[PDB]
Amino acid sequence: RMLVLVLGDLHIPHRCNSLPAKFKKLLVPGKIQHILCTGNLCTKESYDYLKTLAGDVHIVRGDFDENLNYPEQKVVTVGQFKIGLIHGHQVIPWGDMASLALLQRQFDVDILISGHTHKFEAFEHENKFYINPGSATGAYNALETNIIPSFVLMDIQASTVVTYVYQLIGDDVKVERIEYKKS
């Protein structure tokens, strides 16, 4: 039994000082085993926050990350699932579903997760799974004006991912769940 936290595009402090309060309260140490971050937490401060939440943190370089180390793309395994990590600004068109599945084919991952759209999407196509948390802080996006802060955590059982999506719709946190089992 393992649960991981996938979140990105915090944009602190370019467009966001910090996360939403209810979010800040729901993320506590100990519960989260792994952390997969996609977007650009533009400063190492937020990186040490993500290292507060869990021990194994995996980040990838975004377009606005001033850091010196984050890789452009990473493929990490959790249990038995092959997970692919990429911010998503090299996946042109940015929100193209058909372009993302191509990255899946090149990567040969069972779950490919990306961001840079600030729009949360979780779907299964060609028996593969694609997740985009969006901005945990609901940052600014030039293409979308009604942005909803969100994050996703997946509890990889054994050849079975259940993904829960938290969203700050209005004032209270509304959650949804999508499930996927290995091909």
Partner: peptide, 7 residues
């Protein structure tokens, strides 16, 4: 709904 966290 359920949660590995809080409600």
């Amino acid at each position: 709904f359920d949660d590995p966290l809080n409600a």
